[model samples]
Target: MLKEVHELLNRIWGDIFELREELKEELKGFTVEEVSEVFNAYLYIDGKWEEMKYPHPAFAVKPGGEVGATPQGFYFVFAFPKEELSKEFIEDVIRAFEKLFIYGAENFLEDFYNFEHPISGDEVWDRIVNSDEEMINFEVDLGFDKEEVKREIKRFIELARRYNLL
Candidate 1:
C-alpha cells in the first residue's frame, strides 16, 4: 500500500535508517536537544484517519516499518514567482530546490503560493535572536554576513507577512 512512499524515500535519501541517523545528529550540532515529551498528532492518509504512538519522542516505526501514502486528489506544482533578492535582479529558480515544490488544488480566484507552507526560517532566526537576552551580533556569533543574512530573511518575511504566516 505504501510502496509509493518507499519509492519516494529511496529516490530521495536512498536509505531510510541512514536518513534518521543523520537527521538526529544533524540537529545535535545546532541548539539544545529537548527530547520530545508526550505528544499527539493526526494524519490523514488513504481513505481514513489514523493514530500512531511512540515512546514519547522516539518513533515507533523506524522508517520503512509502517509508513503509508495514497494517490490523493492533489497536484504537484513546481513553478512560482521568484521574488527579487537584491541588486534588483529577478530569476525563476524555485524549481532548483529538488523538493521545494508548491502543492495545492487550483482556485478560480488565486494562485497556490499562499496555500503552501510559509517560510519559517525568518521567524526562526527572529526567535533565536529574541529568545536570548544578550544582543546578537549576527556576523560575530553566527559567522555570517549580517546585512546579507537579513536580506535573505527579509525577502521571505515579505511573503510570509503578506500571507500572515508570521
Candidate 2:
C-alpha cells in the first residue's frame, strides 16, 4: 500500500513538471512603458524577465525643435553599456549639471547601473550639428528665424542638463 501511494505521487508530480516545461517553451517575453504625471518617472511594465533586450544599454536623442509634437521639442535618453561609469566624466557632467541645474545629483547618480561613454552632453549635441549641409539633411535651418536660435539654445540646455540622468 505504501509503495502504491509513493508511485501515484511521483506520477502526479512528473506530469505537472512536464506541463510546466511545455508552457515554458511556448511563452514569450514582452515589456511596455507609459508616461506618468511626475518628472523622471514612468509607468513601466516588465513582462519578460527571462529575456535579454540588448547587449549594450541604449543611447538616444531627438532634437525636436518643431515645438508642438509628440516629444515636445526635445528629448534625451542614455544608458551605459556596462555597469561601471567613468569617474572623471561623472564629475565633469555633475559639475556642469550643478552649475546649470542644482540637485542631489551624485546621490542619484551612483544608484544607476551604467553610463554613456563618459561624454559631455553638449559634445554629443554639437556633433549632431556641424555644417549647413548637416543641418539641412534634417531640414533644420538656423538662419531663417531668430526664434530658432532662442529655441535651439533653450532646448540645448534642457537636453544637456539632463546628461546626468542619461
Candidate 3:
C-alpha cells in the first residue's frame, strides 16, 4: 500500500513539476506537508468524481480519516490567479490538473516514471517548456494570457525538472 501510494505521489510530484511556479510561494506560508495534504484530498475528491461520474459532494477526508470540507478551497490558495482564492477557481484548477494528469500520463509516463535507466532528465523539461498551439489554447481556455501562461509553464518546468534530477 505504501508503495502504491508512492507511485501515485511520484506522479503527483511530476505533475507539480509541470507547473510554472513553486506553488509553495502562492500557498502563503503553508508548509509543503500542508500543501501535499491538500493535494491528497484533491486526489481523493478527484478519484471519486471519476469513478462515480459526479463529485463526492462532501468535505475531504484527512490522513486520520477525519472528514474535512474545503480542501479544494485550501488548495486553490496556490492554484488560481487572484489576491484571494475562490471556490470556483479552486474547482477550475482541480479540473485542469485532472485533465493534465490524465493527458500527461498518457503522453509522458514512460519518459518520467521509467525508473530503470530513466530517459535523460532534459527530455521532460524540453517537452514541457516547448509549448505548442494546443497548450496555448488550453491555457487560454483556462483564462490566462498566452504569454504569461508560456512564461509560467517554462518556469515550472525548469524548477520541477531540475529538482527531480537533483
lDDT of 2 by residue, 53-133 (tens): 312111112332121111112122223322232344444443432112111122132222112223454443333233122
TM-score-wise, the better of 1 and 2 is 1
Task: Report the C-alpha lDDT of model 3 over 48-101, residue by residue, as the tens digit.
Answer: 321223231222111111111131311111121122323333234333332232
lDDT of candidate 1 over 14-118, digit per residue (tens): 232333344345424322222233334222334333443522222112211111111221111112222212111111223122212221122221222221343
Q: After superposition, how far is residue 109 of candidate 1 from its true place, in Å?
A: 24
TM per candidate: 0.21, 0.21, 0.20
lDDT of each: 0.27, 0.28, 0.28
Error of 1 at 10 (Å): 18
CA lDDT of 154 in candidate 1?
38
The Cα error of candidate 2 at residue 42, in Å, is: 1.2
Point out the higher-scoring one by lDDT: 1 or 2: 2
Clashing pairs in 3: 20-152, 20-156
Which stretches of candidate 3 lie above 4 Å from their native place?
Answer: 1-28, 31-52, 56-118, 133-166
Candidate 2: which stretches are off by over 4 Å?
Answer: 1-73, 98-166
- Top candidate by TM-score: 1
